[PDB]
Amino acid sequence: PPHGELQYLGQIQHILRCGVRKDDRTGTGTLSVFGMQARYSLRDEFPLLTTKRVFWKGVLEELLWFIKGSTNAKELREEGDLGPVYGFQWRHFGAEYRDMESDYSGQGVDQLQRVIDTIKTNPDDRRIIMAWNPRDLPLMALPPCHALCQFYVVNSELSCQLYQRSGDMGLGVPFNIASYALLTYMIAHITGLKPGDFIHTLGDAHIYLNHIEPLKIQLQREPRPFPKLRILRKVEKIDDFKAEDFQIEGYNPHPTIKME
Amino acid sequence: PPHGELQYLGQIQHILRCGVRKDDRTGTGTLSVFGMQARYSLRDEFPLLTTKRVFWKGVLEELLWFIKGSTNAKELREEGDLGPVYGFQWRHFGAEYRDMESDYSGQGVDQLQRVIDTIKTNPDDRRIIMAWNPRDLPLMALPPCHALCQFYVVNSELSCQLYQRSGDMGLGVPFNIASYALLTYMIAHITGLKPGDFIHTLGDAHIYLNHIEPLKIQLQREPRPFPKLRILRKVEKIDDFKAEDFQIEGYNPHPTIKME
């Protein structure tokens, strides 16, 4: 059966051939297509892309920081306090922010624990849903999310669909595919399920004009078999995962590509 | 180029062959697949499905009622007051509900006017986003939406992506495809853009066990060319559209299918 990374390369090729010129926020140029989806199995493999070396260690450490609900940039204005932003929404959505050293237990909606609790109380549930760009929060009332992850459970397999309103294909998409797939493994481990599929849907799927040439070269590379992800200890709670619990194996990517 | 309805029939066939048994809320059985997408052009055609006669008149009238922000079931408990539900979220999200005859102007977020205003102030915007199942609102704090529509503008064409957390393939999906495509035409008309694509993404795409047999027969029918939708007057504001403004033409569907 075809390697799932072929989906990604195919999407790159489509944006190159068929994308239309469109400006971002800063007035920087992209090639853009509206509406795209790909599925990556998580069964006995882990979709760390192989056509370029993906920064696995950084994927892991940023996710653990999000999970912790941190607003202290330094854990990753002067003192490094980011305000009520990032994993603060995953773990304390809607709580009055005081400071990045304050204690927020029982304050706001914990979307993450809520997902895990529903998986356990009603696995059939169609509402197992959990992110905002920080810049958007004070910009308006009811500001639209950046990403929504929906989880789905059947035959003791956990699957995840991540819909992002925009996706930077060269830089963000690979990092995200690994990030939400890692989260899916974490939650599946703690709820006693097996990972199933990861589905990535995007609104404005785009390539920055600058990335066109390195991406053309990336396309001429052939995917190697996806690695495996091995969780090394039995872990009970989401907040208890540690970077040293995860081991990637059989990962043989092509060389790094630096994209602007 | 292949008729877009082939996407739909293909998805039916996939759920039949590959869907897994899964129970809904009421414990009724379905065949389910997680993660699906289809695109339907709106350029010089209107995706009213042709393999069964779709209730066009009802699509139109329910959308106009949603647009009006109504909570009076009778316009479509005793008196017929539904509470703060449906188009009330499209036009007054978050406003304190008093009654279905109260006046809510300037109260809550009007998502709909906000979409139209962004289309006009910044067409490049990646946040042009606007629905909840009524049953979910009081069930929890920060309750997940049922559907999110994202709009996208490029070369003076308006496109729409509707992501639904679950989709009833036999009954709901056709009705929705026509409903969001009609909304896209309405907004494109008022903002001086041309309709582009409608993309439908679903979380739990499912077929009710009861619909299996009529759907098997629907699959053996061949799509006819999509009709056209013609808006018959120049309309200035979204709230000014009337059912008599729309005419469907060249619609020759196969016979009605009644699904439970």
From Swiss-Prot, chains A, B:
GO terms for molecular function: folic acid binding; mRNA regulatory element binding translation repressor activity; sequence-specific mRNA binding; thymidylate synthase activity. Its main location: nucleus. Keywords: Cytoplasm, Disease variant, Dyskeratosis congenita, Isopeptide bond, Membrane, Methyltransferase, Mitochondrion, Mitochondrion inner membrane, Nucleotide biosynthesis, Nucleus, Phosphoprotein, Transferase, Ubl conjugation. SUPFAM superfamilies: Thymidylate synthase/dCMP hydroxymethylase. One of its GO terms (biological process) is dTMP biosynthetic process. Pfam families: Thymidylat_synt. Its EC number is 2.1.1.45. There is a cross-link at residues 237, 242, 258 (Glycyl lysine isopeptide (Lys-Gly) (interchain with G-Cter in SUMO2)). DUMP binds at residues 25, 126-127, 145-146, 165-168, 176, 206-208. GO terms for cellular component: cytoplasm; cytosol; mitochondrial inner membrane; mitochondrial matrix; mitochondrion; nucleus. Catalyzes the reductive methylation of 2'-deoxyuridine 5'-monophosphate (dUMP) to thymidine 5'-monophosphate (dTMP), using the cosubstrate, 5,10- methylenetetrahydrofolate (CH2H4folate) as a 1-carbon donor and reductant and contributes to the de novo mitochondrial thymidylate biosynthesis pathway. It is linked to Dyskeratosis congenita, digenic: A form of dyskeratosis congenita, a rare multisystem disorder caused by defective telomere maintenance. It is characterized by progressive bone marrow failure, and the clinical triad of reticulated skin hyperpigmentation, nail dystrophy, and mucosal leukoplakia. Common but variable features include premature graying, aplastic anemia, low platelets, osteoporosis, pulmonary fibrosis, and liver fibrosis among others. Early mortality is often associated with bone marrow failure, infections, fatal pulmonary complications, or malignancy. Belongs to the thymidylate synthase family. NCBIfam families: PRK01827.1-3, thym_sym. This is Thymidylate synthase. It comes from Homo sapiens (Human). The lineage of its organism: Eukaryota, Metazoa, Chordata, Craniata, Vertebrata.
